[PDB]
Coordinates of C-alpha atoms (C1' of nucleotides) and ligand atoms in Angstrom, one line a residue:
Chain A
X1345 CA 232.6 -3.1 257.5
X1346 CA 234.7 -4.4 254.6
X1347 CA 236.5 -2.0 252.4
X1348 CA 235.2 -1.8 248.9
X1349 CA 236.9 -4.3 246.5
X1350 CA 238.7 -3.2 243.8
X1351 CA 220.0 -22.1 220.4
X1352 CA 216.9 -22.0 222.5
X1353 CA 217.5 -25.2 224.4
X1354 CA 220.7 -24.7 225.6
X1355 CA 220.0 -20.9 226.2
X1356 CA 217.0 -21.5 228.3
X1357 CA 219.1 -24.3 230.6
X1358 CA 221.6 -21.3 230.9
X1359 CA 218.9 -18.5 231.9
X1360 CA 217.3 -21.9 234.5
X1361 CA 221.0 -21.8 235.7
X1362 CA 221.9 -18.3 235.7
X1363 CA 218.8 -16.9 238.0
X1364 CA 217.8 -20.1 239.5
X1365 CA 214.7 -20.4 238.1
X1366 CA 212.8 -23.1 236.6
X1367 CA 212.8 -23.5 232.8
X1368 CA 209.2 -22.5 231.9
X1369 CA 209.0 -19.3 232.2
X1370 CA 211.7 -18.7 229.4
X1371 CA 209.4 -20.5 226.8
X1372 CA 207.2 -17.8 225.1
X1373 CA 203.2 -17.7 225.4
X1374 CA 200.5 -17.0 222.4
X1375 CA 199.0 -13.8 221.0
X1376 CA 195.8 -15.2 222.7
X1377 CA 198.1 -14.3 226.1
X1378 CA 200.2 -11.4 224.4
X1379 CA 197.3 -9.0 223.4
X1380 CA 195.6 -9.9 226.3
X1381 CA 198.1 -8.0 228.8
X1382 CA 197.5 -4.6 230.0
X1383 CA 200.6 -2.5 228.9
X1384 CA 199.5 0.7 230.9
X1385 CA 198.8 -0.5 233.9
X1386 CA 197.8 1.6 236.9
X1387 CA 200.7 3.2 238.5
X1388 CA 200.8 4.4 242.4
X1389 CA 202.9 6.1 244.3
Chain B
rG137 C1' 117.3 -30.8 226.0
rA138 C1' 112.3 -28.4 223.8
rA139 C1' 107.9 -25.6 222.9
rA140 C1' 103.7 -22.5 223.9
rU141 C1' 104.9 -17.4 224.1
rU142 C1' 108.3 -12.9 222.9
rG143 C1' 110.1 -9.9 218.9
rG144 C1' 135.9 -1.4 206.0
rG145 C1' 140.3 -3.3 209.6
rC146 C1' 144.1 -1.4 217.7
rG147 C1' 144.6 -8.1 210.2
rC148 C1' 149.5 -10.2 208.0
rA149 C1' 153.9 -8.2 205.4
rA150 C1' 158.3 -13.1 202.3
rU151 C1' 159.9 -19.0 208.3
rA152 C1' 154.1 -14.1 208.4
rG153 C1' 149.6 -14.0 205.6
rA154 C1' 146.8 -18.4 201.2
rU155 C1' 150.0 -24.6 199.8
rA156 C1' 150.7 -21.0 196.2
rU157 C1' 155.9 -17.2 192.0
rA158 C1' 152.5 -23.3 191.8
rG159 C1' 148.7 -27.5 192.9
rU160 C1' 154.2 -26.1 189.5
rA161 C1' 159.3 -28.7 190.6
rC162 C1' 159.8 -33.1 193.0
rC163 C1' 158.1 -37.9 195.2
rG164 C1' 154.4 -42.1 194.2
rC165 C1' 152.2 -47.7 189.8
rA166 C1' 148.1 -45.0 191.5
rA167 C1' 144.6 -42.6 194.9
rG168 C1' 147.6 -39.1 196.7
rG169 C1' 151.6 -36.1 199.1
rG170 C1' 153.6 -31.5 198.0
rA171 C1' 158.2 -27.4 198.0
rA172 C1' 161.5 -23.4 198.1
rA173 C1' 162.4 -18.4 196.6
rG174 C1' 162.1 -11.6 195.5
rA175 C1' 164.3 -6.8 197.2
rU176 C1' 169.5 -0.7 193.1
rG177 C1' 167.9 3.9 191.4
rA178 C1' 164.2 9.4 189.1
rA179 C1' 166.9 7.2 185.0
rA180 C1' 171.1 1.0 184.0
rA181 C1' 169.8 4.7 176.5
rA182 C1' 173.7 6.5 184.2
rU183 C1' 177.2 -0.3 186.4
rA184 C1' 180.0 1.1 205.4
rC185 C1' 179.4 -0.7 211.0
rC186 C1' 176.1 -5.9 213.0
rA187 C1' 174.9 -13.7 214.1
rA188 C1' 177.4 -18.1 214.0
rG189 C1' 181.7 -19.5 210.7
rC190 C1' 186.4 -17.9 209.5
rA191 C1' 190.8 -14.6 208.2
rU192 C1' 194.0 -10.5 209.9
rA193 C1' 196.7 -13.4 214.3
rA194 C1' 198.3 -21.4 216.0
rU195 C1' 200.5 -22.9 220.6
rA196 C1' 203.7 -22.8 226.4
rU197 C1' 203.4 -26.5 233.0
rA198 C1' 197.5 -26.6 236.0
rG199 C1' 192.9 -28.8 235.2
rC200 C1' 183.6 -26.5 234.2
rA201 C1' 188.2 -22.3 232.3
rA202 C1' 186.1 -18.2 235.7
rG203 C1' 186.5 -15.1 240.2
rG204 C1' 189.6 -12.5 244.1
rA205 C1' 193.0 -10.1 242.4
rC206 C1' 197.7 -8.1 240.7
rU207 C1' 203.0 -3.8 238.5
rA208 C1' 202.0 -7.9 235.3
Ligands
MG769 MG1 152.9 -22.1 202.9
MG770 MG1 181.1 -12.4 213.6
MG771 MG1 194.7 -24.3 240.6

RNA sequence: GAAAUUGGGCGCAAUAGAUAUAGUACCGCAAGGGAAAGAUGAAAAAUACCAAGCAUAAUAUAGCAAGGACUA
């Protein structure tokens, strides 16, 4: 074990960048897609 | 295909029922063809919720548009 030390373009490339992701999924989606999502969904456990 | 002979409504109710509110409007030189549509209430001397189409609310990679799903 170690011891324990001690504008929308341009901000989309950064998000890509910063969690290694693609850049589409920053881009937002329609209402159509927006009121269509289930906001309580079914919990378990 | 003979003859003798024998002896009111389990209706329609405005695309229905009349073409019919009218044989008018309209069309045709003419004979002739020929429509559509209305809905308050006791009194007008009392002025909701439902088709398609839209709007509230445009859009986000990929595709008979869904289905299996899925925390989404
Ligand atoms: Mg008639
Ligand atoms: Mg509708
Ligand atoms: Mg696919």
């Amino acid at each position: 074990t170690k011891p324990i030390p001690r504008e929308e373009g341009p901000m989309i490339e950064q998000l890509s960048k910063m969690f290694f992701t693609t850049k589409h999924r920053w881009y937002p989606h329609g209402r159509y897609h927006r009121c269509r999502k289930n906001l309580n969904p079914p919990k378990d456990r």
